[PDB]
Design a protein around this ligand. Sequence first.
Ligand code: NAG
Ligand code: NAG
Ligand code: NAG
Ligand code: NAG
Ligand code: NAG
Ligand code: NAG
Ligand code: NAG
Ligand code: NAG
Ligand code: NAG
Ligand code: NAG
Lengths: 49, 296, 49, 50, 50, 225
Amino acid sequence: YNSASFSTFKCYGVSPTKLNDLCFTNVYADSFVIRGDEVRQIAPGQTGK
Amino acid sequence: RVQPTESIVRFPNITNLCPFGEVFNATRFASVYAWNRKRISNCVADYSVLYNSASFSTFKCYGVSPTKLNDLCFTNVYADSFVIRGDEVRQIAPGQTGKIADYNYKLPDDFTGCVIAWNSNNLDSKVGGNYNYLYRLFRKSNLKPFERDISTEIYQAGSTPCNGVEGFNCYFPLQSYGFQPTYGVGYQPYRVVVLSFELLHAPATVCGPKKSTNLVKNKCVNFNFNGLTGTGVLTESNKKFLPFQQFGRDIDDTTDAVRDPQTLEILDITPCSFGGVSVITPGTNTSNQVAVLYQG
Amino acid sequence: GRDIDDTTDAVRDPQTLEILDITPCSFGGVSVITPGTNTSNQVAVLYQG
Amino acid sequence: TLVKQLSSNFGAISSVLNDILARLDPPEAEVQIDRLITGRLQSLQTYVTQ
Amino acid sequence: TLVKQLSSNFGAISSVLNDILARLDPPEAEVQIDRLITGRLQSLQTYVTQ
Amino acid sequence: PAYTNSFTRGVYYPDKVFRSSVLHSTQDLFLPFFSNVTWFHANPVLPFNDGVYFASTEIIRGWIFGTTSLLIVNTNVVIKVCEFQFCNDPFLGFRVYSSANNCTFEYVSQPKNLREFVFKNIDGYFKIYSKHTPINLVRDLPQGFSALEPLVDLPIGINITRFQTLLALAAYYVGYLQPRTFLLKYNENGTITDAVDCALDPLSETKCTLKSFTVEKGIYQTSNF
Ligand SMILES: *[C@@H]1O[C@H](CO)[C@@H](O)[C@H](O)[C@H]1NC(C)=O
Ligand SMILES: *[C@@H]1O[C@H](CO)[C@@H](O)[C@H](O)[C@H]1NC(C)=O
Ligand SMILES: *[C@@H]1O[C@H](CO)[C@@H](O)[C@H](O)[C@H]1NC(C)=O
Ligand SMILES: *[C@@H]1O[C@H](CO)[C@@H](O)[C@H](O)[C@H]1NC(C)=O
Ligand SMILES: *[C@@H]1O[C@H](CO)[C@@H](O)[C@H](O)[C@H]1NC(C)=O
Ligand SMILES: *[C@@H]1O[C@H](CO)[C@@H](O)[C@H](O)[C@H]1NC(C)=O
Ligand SMILES: *[C@@H]1O[C@H](CO)[C@@H](O)[C@H](O)[C@H]1NC(C)=O
Ligand SMILES: *[C@@H]1O[C@H](CO)[C@@H](O)[C@H](O)[C@H]1NC(C)=O
Ligand SMILES: *[C@@H]1O[C@H](CO)[C@@H](O)[C@H](O)[C@H]1NC(C)=O
Ligand SMILES: *[C@@H]1O[C@H](CO)[C@@H](O)[C@H](O)[C@H]1NC(C)=O
């Protein structure tokens, strides 16, 4: 969060400030490149191309 | 044991009826983050007429039976009203958590009373969506039992001090609802009235409809003085009560005196005679006679 | 470490690898030594242990 | 002590049977009267042993 | 024996009080706390009788 | 503003029940014994932490409470409780407020001595106790017992933290109540006759433990350390 102003730093279901305390298992990482207008499409319960 | 003979009940002669319709179906309620408190006192209530008929989605009474709400007296019944999200109508209960549970309205862990809700998808389902109804999302800490907050300040998240810039890591603390008339049941607005009341605070006057009965004395009877139920022998005594005192106690915290609400006279209470029974027998080989001896 | 009755008696520092003893804080019972109310009102106080 | 051990809640809502019976339906009062019974039985047992 | 008795569930999920207080919500953790308290009072009444 | 001390003053009837020939232990807000009580002359903003023991030996009529709004004056009494606009010097001539915009509860009652009062805010009430007793010693709060009796119980429920006196254009003491436990002693008539502060001295705690006012020779266990 103390970085180069992540534009869409917004977690779902869990508060980002409480991420550190809780312990998860086997995190996956997905990386790709899209356009600015298409960033709003990446969200649970949302549709679009 | 000495069995009772008749029963007497004494409630104060109060004529005016508690205003309930002025609270339940009013013109417009308030938001969930700012809820008003209507205090009801000094009247004769009737919760059964609000129990039957009409159409209420939920009627859940905690710590008291809704059926028996018309014979016990109370002390300054409170009333709260607000409009709630459809899926959170069950989130207002003692103990259980939630967003609005700890950020809008937190009931105590020992709450007593009744939670009343009913459908409000007719007048509050505006075609464009009522934007007047507003809820809070961000707060530094959780709320306390029966706490309200109105103040709106820019929230702060970690570093990058906000001090009113509503920028990065800074959010407006509270967000609206929006009520389109075609949403599902999870989004549809609901209307909630929370009734809460304290039992042992003072000898108050709000009571259910119960006709009084003439006083009897020097007989083991059942009495009912303003929700105080017990069996005893009511006499006339000379103990001096100060004008503000109502009840009376003894060395081991047992009610041995009382003041009747109507006549305002001092009466004592003495338990009806008890005792064990012992039988003297000369043995069932010589004779079949006995001799009973009440002990006390 | 435990000694005879499943009570922790010594622990190891997880960063410097040192053994540290553990001893309970001091408790007891306050008592009042009085010569009688009908003789005086001066008392003395005894802390038990 | 035996008499004073009659104004304790023991975990119920009120230490009065005539109050509990006048505020709760039978389905939901026997989870309260039971706590009262347990507490008062233990009090009597201690008294008798002493 | 009185000291060693402090390491038994008595029906709760754990003997350590802090784990129960830091693993469960209060209104539900009250029953586990009450189970432990009942067990330990019944463990002190013995060692006084005997 | 001099400083004096109270001598077992400021005990009231905590409950509405009647007791006779009983030694009771109540846990409520009480003024601690031998406490340091201020002694003003004749009116700044006096803080209202939890309660106030206002005693005057008489010109002193009013008590405007609030945060920056209850009001009591002496017509006989008006208790208008609503938003006011207070002046720099709120005295009775008379300008104390500007208007009553969103006004609320308004109780007008029917239109050598020591006056003692106790004000409290618990769960939405404003309790006032009082007791008028004769005295011949000028100022210098005497030694004895005067159990205060309940006077009114206002169902107001507001946020009071600062109060100020309405001087009538005169000495009054102000002591603050604290959470303390007492051992009240009732006589056969139902009146409070004596009290013991169970947190003042070791002997007081010993008296409080045994539930008696006299202690014989010996050693007793009071509490834990
Ligand atoms: C990698 O990216 C993160 C995110 O902006 C930044 O904080 C970090 O300094 C970067 N590391 C390097 C070596 O540039
Ligand atoms: C609704 O208001 C009317 C007033 O005309 C009255 O029946 C009562 O106060 C309310 N009834 C219900 C069921 O809300
Ligand atoms: C109503 O009760 C009062 C006592 O508060 C009593 O004085 C009065 O006589 C009662 N009314 C009637 C009609 O008896
Ligand atoms: C009853 O008494 C008679 C004599 O008094 C004796 O012979 C007989 O055995 C007794 N029977 C019993 C059952 O006690
Ligand atoms: C942990 O890190 C500190 C920091 O330098 C170091 O002094 C210490 O030796 C380390 N402990 C272990 C067990 O490596
Ligand atoms: C205290 O002792 C004196 C003489 O020793 C006696 O006269 C008095 O009665 C005693 N006080 C009480 C309360 O017994
Ligand atoms: C009250 O406080 C003042 C100084 O603040 C002190 O001189 C005075 O002795 C105190 N009162 C008592 C009874 O000790
Ligand atoms: C009451 O007033 C004080 C200022 O005197 C303020 O700080 C506080 O937030 C207000 N509300 C409560 C509940 O104390
Ligand atoms: C008080 O009334 C005025 C108009 O007379 C109104 O503007 C103001 O909002 C009201 N204040 C409250 C707290 O209702
Ligand atoms: C109780 O009050 C009566 C009423 O006058 C009085 O005669 C009696 O002395 C009082 N009892 C006391 C002071 O112990």
